[PDB]
Amino acid sequence: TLKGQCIAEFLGTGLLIFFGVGCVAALKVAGASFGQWEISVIWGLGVAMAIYLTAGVSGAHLNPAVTIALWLFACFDKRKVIPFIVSQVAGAFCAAALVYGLYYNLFFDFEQTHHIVRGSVESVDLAGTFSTYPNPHINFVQAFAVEMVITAILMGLILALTDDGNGVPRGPLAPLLIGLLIAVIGASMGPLTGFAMNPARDFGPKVFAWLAGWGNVAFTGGRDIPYFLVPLFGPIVGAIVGAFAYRKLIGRHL
Amino acid sequence: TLKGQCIAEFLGTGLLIFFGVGCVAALKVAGASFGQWEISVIWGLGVAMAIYLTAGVSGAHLNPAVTIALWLFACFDKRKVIPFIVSQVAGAFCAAALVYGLYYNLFFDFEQTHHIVRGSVESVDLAGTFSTYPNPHINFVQAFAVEMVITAILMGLILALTDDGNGVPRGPLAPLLIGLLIAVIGASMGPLTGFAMNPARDFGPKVFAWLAGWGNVAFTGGRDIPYFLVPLFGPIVGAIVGAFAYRKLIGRHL
Amino acid sequence: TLKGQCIAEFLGTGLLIFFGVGCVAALKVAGASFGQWEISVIWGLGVAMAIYLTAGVSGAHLNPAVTIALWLFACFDKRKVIPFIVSQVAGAFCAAALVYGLYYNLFFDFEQTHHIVRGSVESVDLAGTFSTYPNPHINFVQAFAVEMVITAILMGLILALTDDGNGVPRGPLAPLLIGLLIAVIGASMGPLTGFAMNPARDFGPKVFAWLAGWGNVAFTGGRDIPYFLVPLFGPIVGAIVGAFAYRKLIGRHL
Amino acid sequence: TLKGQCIAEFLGTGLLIFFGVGCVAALKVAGASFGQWEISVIWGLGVAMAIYLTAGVSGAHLNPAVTIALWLFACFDKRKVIPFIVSQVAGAFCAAALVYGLYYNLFFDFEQTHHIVRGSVESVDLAGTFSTYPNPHINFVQAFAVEMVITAILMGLILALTDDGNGVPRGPLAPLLIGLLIAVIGASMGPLTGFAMNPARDFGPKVFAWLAGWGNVAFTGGRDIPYFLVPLFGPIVGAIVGAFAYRKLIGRHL
Numbered sequence A, B, C, D: 001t002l003k004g005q006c007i008a009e010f011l012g013t014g015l016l017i018f019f020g021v022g023c024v025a026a027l028k029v030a031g032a033s034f035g036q037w038e039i040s041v042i043w044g045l046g047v048a049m050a051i052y053l054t055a056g057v058s059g060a061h062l063n064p065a066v067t068i069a070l071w072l073f074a075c076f077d078k079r080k081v082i083p084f085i086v087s088q089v090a091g092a093f094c095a096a097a098l099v100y101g102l103y104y105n106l107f108f109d110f111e112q113t114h115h116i117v118r119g120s121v122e123s124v125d126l127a128g129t130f131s132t133y134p135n136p137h138i139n140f141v142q143a144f145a146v147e148m149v150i151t152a153i154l155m156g157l158i159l160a161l162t163d164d165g166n167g168v169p170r171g172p173l174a175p176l177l178i179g180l181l182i183a184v185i186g187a188s189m190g191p192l193t194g195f196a197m198n199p200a201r202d203f204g205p206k207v208f209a210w211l212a213g214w215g216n217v218a219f220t221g222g223r224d225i226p227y228f229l230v231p232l233f234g235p236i237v238g239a240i241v242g243a244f245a246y247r248k249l250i251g252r253h254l
């Protein structure tokens, strides 16, 4: 039932944000030792678990860019596109709230200790706990290209890993492999834009940080062009290219 | 036979405490370099091995919260609930003793070198080798919510990973995936309460540290409200919610 | 179709260079925390994904040394040897360009900040982002022996992991295991020559760095004997030994 | 054929020493960043590959303690016990020589730079590249207990992971899981005695270091009681206990 699938998409998306935002909070306000690889593998494995939990019900999109691409290139029912997307964004938002609630005290003590004013340009770093912001050395267009390229890779490899007509079927290994895929993308490209690749994963938590005291910088990242636009459209404009490229360059040759 | 299952639960629970408490001892008194992720993945993989060793005999609960939840939502024989729980706690206690016995000299030389009085409030850090204690910035109720939420997630995902009617069956991959699940929980939430999620895993070693010279602080953690209560009830009150949530939100939609 | 296989070899080789060169760029110009193991596992998993993507089409050589060895010991069609090799080198070259394009600004700001003249002997370190260079303490012949030994091991274990007549078939696990194989080679021998083991993986990006401003040092590494020769021939002269050794010492005993 | 099995045991044992001793050399003389977990996982995965390579031919013992235990509790042909053990020790010795040959220059430059006299008590640290030595805070008997306990665990879990009558068969996952088992043992107990658990893995390289200039300390570790005895007998006296415990406590209940 659609209602059951929307619930799964809500829970699955919330689950990966819980693990994801959770580990970044540990790094930022709990002093945990996490390198780029550790942060990336935790996000990836977190995603794998979310897939294992919801694949049997909704098919585990847990990503608006993936839903839209599967609609355009996988015959996914267009009537379920918006219901899935609203569920994904709602789950991400709620999970972000839950993580903030559990780490609550550490956020305030860190801001107090380091004299950080939440909502200021300097608080964007802590806001990074919830969503993505661009590397200091790159601009809007450059950040957009990054998200576009990595999401295309994400979509393309998701199709390849789940395409049973491509080599030996992965079976139950598929979700795990998708998690490791996210891990290598995060390790190789993460320093540039925080490998968002998912509109729900970014906007939901951004809206929460906005409500929790970070204000407008949660959306702009302290940049002239409001940054939230990149994690919103770059992934969509990227998953479509990825899906297209797979069928034309790999599938059409299987 | 029940006697055979209690032996397996004793060994399995002891095995994961051996690996778990062992790596934390290495970190604390042997100067090993371990970040939050490393500590978490070792605990998780340690649990996976314990499952591989005992699943075929007892079903590998190795956790009182899991036993009680499987009794309430999986038709697990109620007559085996207490026998399993006593075996789990006894195994955890013994393994803790074994690890202390192997690292014995390093404990005393570390305390001597750093002028630490075992049993004092400052020795709670070393006591952390055996069991869990709350992050300095959070209190009793906050720590209780953490354990409740993560154990619910643990139970829920354990059911999802072992539910063959949910997507493609994991088969022999299940235990490993459960280990990785524990790893991501430990990495994302571990800095808050040491992701106990298991009454036997915490109480058994706490009782040992109590007997080995840490005294009352082993139970209180140096807090007004005796901390041991959290790792004792939070997990139980959490595994039940998790089990419930799975059947109602995911299973009922498969 | 051969055209379809050359496209897959181009994409697959480009994919592993993207992830590989990407993570090294993060380490060198983005300040990411990556140890030898992290760098090695990312390269390995990156290779695994490239295999999953192309195995079903071309068989996933993604390495000139592997193509030549499979031709000499696996009846691989000799008419496809050169088409595969040109595709592999072209894909590696293009991916290197793409990674440089995404990290563009970080390269210049790093060189500016650390007063590094691109093209100078001191810029060889940054050039290391794209390809391999020898450890300061070893010379040409020593570096050649390293690449020869590790590629022989690579080829031999690739055959063993994919040989269904050897123990229990790995099935869909094969690519992942090959990735982990590369990871352990990189961790144990990587500090010596950057575990190139693949002519396309090294020459393509070297030619790019040459064109992007590093000049002649991209090829020589600042050594009397032009270093590029080692990653070019050592792997070939090594994959053949490895393939030979497998059939004679292991296969002939199955 | 026995000759073919002895060759596989020689190669397999040599392979894991190559990866193992290789990564420790990187850490000690090549300045690579490796924590206890990284070193442990590399050794483990290295062992997994050695198993994948030789399991189909010899059954992949690659360890005298395992051969002897399988003879006493698995009906392994006693006529092949000594031939296997000589092959294991010879392979370990040769691999150690090969690793030293590839890292040759780094050893001398490190000793020169840090004014270390090879053969002196202070050179035992570098000798640690090849084999195991006890933690400064523990003595002979304590080190013996460690090796005994961990090898018993090793043997017992190897039997459990390969016992198809125990839960869902692992199939091709078995070797990998055994590698991860070694990884968690190394992470939790490695700081105490270098988790030798294998007479061939320790004696062979010790004999090499002895011949390569470390002299008598290679065998004694600079201790009154010659240390080499522990990695020699502790594992044997431990694998037997482990094998026994498995059949009596787990197998007899399947």
Ligand SMILES: CCCCCCCCO[C@@H]1O[C@H](CO)[C@@H](O)[C@H](O)[C@H]1O
Residues within 6 Å of the ligand: A094, A097, A098, A100, A101, A102, A104, A212
């Ligand atoms: C299983 C799903 C449970 C969802 C619980 C959501 C709990 C939200 O948590 C709450 O969020 C508030 C706003 O950020 C904070 O101010 C509170 O301190 C916090 O407890």
Ligand SMILES: CCCCCCCCO[C@@H]1O[C@H](CO)[C@@H](O)[C@H](O)[C@H]1O
Residues within 6 Å of the ligand: A094, A097, A208, A210, A211, A212, A213, A214
């Ligand atoms: C599940 C629904 C959660 C809704 C968002 C609640 C966020 C509460 O968060 C609070 O917001 C206040 C106003 O910004 C801030 O001043 C506080 O510091 C912050 O704790």
Ligand SMILES: CCCCCCCCO[C@@H]1O[C@H](CO)[C@@H](O)[C@H](O)[C@H]1O
Residues within 6 Å of the ligand: A089, A203, A216, A219, A220, A226, A232
């Ligand atoms: C699913 C995502 C839909 C996003 C629709 C656009 C939401 C824009 O949101 C708006 O962004 C501005 C940024 O400066 C702010 O000034 C506004 O307060 C904020 O509400």
Ligand SMILES: CCCCCCCCO[C@@H]1O[C@H](CO)[C@@H](O)[C@H](O)[C@H]1O
Residues within 6 Å of the ligand: B094, B097, B098, B100, B101, B102, B104, B212
């Ligand atoms: C296979 C299971 C073996 C269980 C052996 C338990 C060994 C306990 O070990 C002992 O514990 C004592 C109390 O902590 C210490 O004082 C001793 O030094 C130590 O050797």
Ligand SMILES: CCCCCCCCO[C@@H]1O[C@H](CO)[C@@H](O)[C@H](O)[C@H]1O
Residues within 6 Å of the ligand: B094, B097, B208, B210, B211, B212, B213, B214
């Ligand atoms: C397997 C059964 C083990 C029972 C617990 C034995 C713990 C012994 O441990 C010892 O306890 C003494 C009293 O606290 C302390 O003074 C010592 O420092 C400590 O080594």
Ligand SMILES: CCCCCCCCO[C@@H]1O[C@H](CO)[C@@H](O)[C@H](O)[C@H]1O
Residues within 6 Å of the ligand: B089, B203, B216, B219, B220, B226, B232
């Ligand atoms: C399976 C777990 C059952 C636990 C039952 C409660 C055990 C309480 O244990 C008690 O805790 C107090 C804490 O300050 C101490 O003062 C006591 O000495 C100690 O025995």
Ligand SMILES: CCCCCCCCO[C@@H]1O[C@H](CO)[C@@H](O)[C@H](O)[C@H]1O
Residues within 6 Å of the ligand: C094, C097, C098, C100, C101, C102, C104, C212
């Ligand atoms: C899906 C495959 C897309 C291939 C795109 C290749 C893009 C190359 O990228 C370009 O490379 C130039 C030379 O290094 C740089 O100067 C540019 O700044 C960069 O954008």
Ligand SMILES: CCCCCCCCO[C@@H]1O[C@H](CO)[C@@H](O)[C@H](O)[C@H]1O
Residues within 6 Å of the ligand: C094, C097, C208, C210, C211, C212, C213, C214
């Ligand atoms: C996909 C085809 C890419 C072809 C290579 C383009 C490399 C452009 O790279 C540019 O090269 C210039 C000349 O070396 C340098 O001076 C610049 O600093 C560099 O950005």
Ligand SMILES: CCCCCCCCO[C@@H]1O[C@H](CO)[C@@H](O)[C@H](O)[C@H]1O
Residues within 6 Å of the ligand: C089, C203, C216, C219, C220, C226, C232
């Ligand atoms: C598939 C790989 C084929 C490689 C063929 C040899 C290419 C050599 O390339 C040459 O190397 C010299 C190094 O100093 C340079 O001086 C030249 O400018 C460069 O073009």
Ligand SMILES: CCCCCCCCO[C@@H]1O[C@H](CO)[C@@H](O)[C@H](O)[C@H]1O
Residues within 6 Å of the ligand: D094, D097, D098, D100, D101, D102, D104, D212
């Ligand atoms: C595939 C198996 C190849 C085995 C090759 C063994 C090579 C030994 O290597 C040699 O060892 C000597 C003694 O340590 C050193 O002095 C030499 O420098 C080194 O090259």
Ligand SMILES: CCCCCCCCO[C@@H]1O[C@H](CO)[C@@H](O)[C@H](O)[C@H]1O
Residues within 6 Å of the ligand: D094, D097, D208, D210, D211, D212, D213, D214
């Ligand atoms: C494969 C057979 C290898 C046999 C062992 C050769 C070890 C050579 O190693 C050499 O040994 C000399 C004597 O100790 C030392 O003085 C040198 O420093 C050392 O390089």
Ligand SMILES: CCCCCCCCO[C@@H]1O[C@H](CO)[C@@H](O)[C@H](O)[C@H]1O
Residues within 6 Å of the ligand: D089, D203, D216, D219, D220, D226, D232
């Ligand atoms: C398979 C392993 C068999 C080992 C048999 C015992 C080998 C002992 O070896 C001996 O050890 C002594 C240690 O101080 C040295 O003095 C000798 O030079 C050395 O040859």
